[PDB]
Design an enzyme around this catalytic site. Structure first.
Site, PDB file in Angstrom:
ATOM      1  N   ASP A  32       0.813  -1.196   0.000  1.00 20.08           N
ATOM      2  CA  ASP A  32       0.000   0.000   0.000  1.00 20.08           C
ATOM      3  C   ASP A  32       0.867   1.275   0.000  1.00 20.08           C
ATOM      4  O   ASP A  32       1.994   1.261  -0.511  1.00 20.08           O
ATOM      5  CB  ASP A  32      -0.967  -0.070   1.217  1.00 20.08           C
ATOM      6  CG  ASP A  32      -2.304   0.654   0.965  1.00 20.08           C
ATOM      7  OD1 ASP A  32      -2.267   1.911   0.865  1.00 20.08           O
ATOM      8  OD2 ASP A  32      -3.396  -0.014   0.932  1.00 20.08           O
ATOM      9  N   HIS A  62      -3.911   5.996   3.729  1.00 21.84           N
ATOM     10  CA  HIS A  62      -4.605   4.796   3.285  1.00 21.84           C
ATOM     11  C   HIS A  62      -4.066   3.474   3.823  1.00 21.84           C
ATOM     12  O   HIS A  62      -4.839   2.671   4.327  1.00 21.84           O
ATOM     13  CB  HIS A  62      -4.524   4.765   1.729  1.00 21.84           C
ATOM     14  CG  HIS A  62      -5.394   3.742   1.092  1.00 21.84           C
ATOM     15  ND1 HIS A  62      -4.935   2.475   0.793  1.00 21.84           N
ATOM     16  CD2 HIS A  62      -6.682   3.792   0.672  1.00 21.84           C
ATOM     17  CE1 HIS A  62      -5.905   1.788   0.220  1.00 21.84           C
ATOM     18  NE2 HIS A  62      -6.975   2.557   0.142  1.00 21.84           N
ATOM     19  N   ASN A 153     -13.888   0.165  -6.848  1.00 25.39           N
ATOM     20  CA  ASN A 153     -14.899   1.113  -6.458  1.00 25.39           C
ATOM     21  C   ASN A 153     -15.763   1.709  -7.559  1.00 25.39           C
ATOM     22  O   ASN A 153     -16.509   2.620  -7.287  1.00 25.39           O
ATOM     23  CB  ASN A 153     -14.319   2.247  -5.614  1.00 25.39           C
ATOM     24  CG  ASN A 153     -13.711   1.745  -4.289  1.00 25.39           C
ATOM     25  OD1 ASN A 153     -14.019   0.632  -3.810  1.00 25.39           O
ATOM     26  ND2 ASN A 153     -12.820   2.536  -3.727  1.00 25.39           N
ATOM     27  N   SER A 215     -11.358  -1.029  -0.498  1.00 28.13           N
ATOM     28  CA  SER A 215     -10.034  -1.102   0.177  1.00 28.13           C
ATOM     29  C   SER A 215     -10.168  -1.403   1.681  1.00 28.13           C
ATOM     30  O   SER A 215      -9.233  -1.920   2.284  1.00 28.13           O
ATOM     31  CB  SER A 215      -9.349   0.258   0.147  1.00 28.13           C
ATOM     32  OG  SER A 215      -8.765   0.546  -1.111  1.00 28.13           O
TER      33      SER A 215
END
Ligand SMILES: [Ca+2]
Ligand SMILES: [Ca+2]
Ligand SMILES: [Cl-]
Ligand SMILES: [Cl-]
Ligand SMILES: [Cl-]
Ligand SMILES: [Cl-]
Ligand SMILES: [Cl-]
Ligand SMILES: [Cl-]
Ligand SMILES: [Cl-]
Ligand SMILES: [Cl-]
Ligand SMILES: [Cl-]
Ligand SMILES: [Cl-]
Ligand SMILES: [Cl-]
Ligand SMILES: [Cl-]
Ligand SMILES: [Cl-]
Ligand SMILES: [Cl-]
Ligand SMILES: [Cl-]
Ligand code: NA
Ligand code: NA
Ligand code: NA
Ligand code: NA
Lengths: 269, 181
Positions: A32, A62, A153, A215
């Protein structure tokens, strides 16, 4: 004081914790934007593959949020992970901007293989296919890594890459009524769903934040994999994956939900 | 006839779906193209230029807009779709579009979906044109709907990110094929 985020209770992680499963001894890599040191996380190590961004600290937020959903420490502060004793590794494959190349991500997966990670969480993707990226997923899988990735998404009826590659376990997002969140991508590639709306987790600067996304769903599954692995140390990445699917709570069509809602209680029973 | 081809930095014709970095024709002008987020709201990511001449950015994949032609050579002055070969925390399309001709404000190039597409939805159509500079094979990028707009870079040295958009001087570019990828 410590809160139990609603998705942690939805996947039934506390019932697994009550049977002594917290993910101890399980190596989980978070591929990530990095992971910032935080009071409610324990980061064991990792590496960066982002040119110009050599440290494993999170300049976006994130990766830190994703890490808390997996392994936020069980203590008297902040939140609680699905797998609070999992051994967390920060593998920075996305820059602070939030984007990564085929090559950053592929070197992150190679790192996970070379360091004996049991689980790699990839809360990242796009509609861009890449044979080089598929090879890297295949290679990590052949080396014992369970690769878990976000379905995407866009709201579309096919899923994002790398999740769409067969030997990534693709995770969609549910809401508080066990319905597909409207942004959550689905399709034949989807394996399972998990909570992905109003997910409070760890955030840089010793904070917490509530995000929505596939996520956020994915770390619920990566954590549950860690619970199953602690219970069954001789199980392969494939056996863990099948068992998480076989014990998921079915929600309707497999095209929209895959096997259904991940259930850490049934998976470890 | 049908327009002449665009060429990469090695002299070969651009092909649909192959991967090309989009470099400044003059390295003194900066690096290749990347994605940059809001400060507040991260996604959708904007297309931006790396200020460092040594950074190639992400490669782009170029495809003819509209009906598929048989040869797959990318031609000058011909509508094409452009998307980055890259993976994001946004988990959304990396295809470029320019801000709608119907919206107020500056026009930037951004990635991902829009709420409220324009009627024709041609904001994801770009053209590559010859730059009267081009001792060797150098190009400008434009977006055409009801008018044509060449793309330049909003430089900032803060610096905030250098956003691609409706501004002149234009950003003159060259296409470098990704090394065996
Ligand atoms: Ca805690
Ligand atoms: Ca300028
Ligand atoms: Cl909550
Ligand atoms: Cl038991
Ligand atoms: Cl390490
Ligand atoms: Cl490193
Ligand atoms: Cl860094
Ligand atoms: Cl607290
Ligand atoms: Cl490729
Ligand atoms: Cl291949
Ligand atoms: Cl699919
Ligand atoms: Cl419910
Ligand atoms: Cl801090
Ligand atoms: Cl919050
Ligand atoms: Cl999209
Ligand atoms: Cl503006
Ligand atoms: Cl320029
Ligand atoms: Na998959
Ligand atoms: Na499926
Ligand atoms: Na909240
Ligand atoms: Na020329």
């Amino acid at each position: 004081a410590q809160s139990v985020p609603w998705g942690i209770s939805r996947v039934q992680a506390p019932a697994a914790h009550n049977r002594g499963l917290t993910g101890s001894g399980v190596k989980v890599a978070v591929l990530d934007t990095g992971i910032s040191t935080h009071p409610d996380l324990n980061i064991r190590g990792g590496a960066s593959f982002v040119p110009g961004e050599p440290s494993t600290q999170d300049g976006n937020g994130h990766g830190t949020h994703v890490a808390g959903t997996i392994a936020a420490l069980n203590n008297s502060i902040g939140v609680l992970g699905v797998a609070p004793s999992a051994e967390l590794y920060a593998v920075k494959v996305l820059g602070a901007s939030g984007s990564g190349s085929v090559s950053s991500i592929a070197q992150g997966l190679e790192w996970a293989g070379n360091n004996g990670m049991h689980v790699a969480n990839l809360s990242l993707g796009s509609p861009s296919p890449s044979a080089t990226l598929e090879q890297a997923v295949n290679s990590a899988t052949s080396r014992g890594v369970l690769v878990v990735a976000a379905s995407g998404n866009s709201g579309a009826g096919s899923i994002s890459y790398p999740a769409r590659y067969a030997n990534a376990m693709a995770v969609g997002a549910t809401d508080q009524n066990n319905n597909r969140a409207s942004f959550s991508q689905y399709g034949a590639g989807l394996d399972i769903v998990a909570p992905g709306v109003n997910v409070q987790s760890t955030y840089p600067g010793s904070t917490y934040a509530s995000l929505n996304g596939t996520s956020m769903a994915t770390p619920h599954v990566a954590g549950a994999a860690a619970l199953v692995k602690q219970k069954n140390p001789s199980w392969s990445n494939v056996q863990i994956r099948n068992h998480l699917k076989n014990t998921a709570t079915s929600l309707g069509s497999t095209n929209l939900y895959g096997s259904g809602l991940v259930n850490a209680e049934a998976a470890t029973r | 006839a049908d327009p002449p081809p665009v060429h990469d930095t090695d002299g070969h014709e651009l092909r649909a779906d192959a991967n090309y970095y989009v470099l400044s024709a003059n390295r003194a002008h900066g690096g290749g193209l990347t994605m940059a987020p809001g400060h507040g709201r991260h996604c959708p990511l904007f297309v931006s230029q790396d200020p460092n001449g040594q950074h190639d950015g992400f490669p782009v994949r170029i495809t003819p807009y509209g009906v598929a032609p048989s040869d797959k050579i990318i031609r000058l002055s011909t509508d094409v779709r452009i998307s980055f070969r890259a993976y994001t925390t946004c988990l959304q399309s990396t295809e470029w579009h320019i801000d709608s001709e119907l919206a107020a404000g500056r026009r930037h190039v951004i990635t991902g979906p829009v709420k409220d597409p324009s009627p024709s939805g041609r904001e994801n159509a770009f053209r590559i044109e010859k730059y009267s500079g081009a001792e060797v094979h150098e190009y400008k990028l434009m977006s055409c709907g009801d008018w044509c707009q060449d793309l330049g870079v909003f430089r900032d040295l803060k610096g905030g990110a250098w956003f691609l958009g409706a501004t002149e001087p234009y950003h003159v570019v060259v296409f470098k094929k990704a090394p065996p990828a």
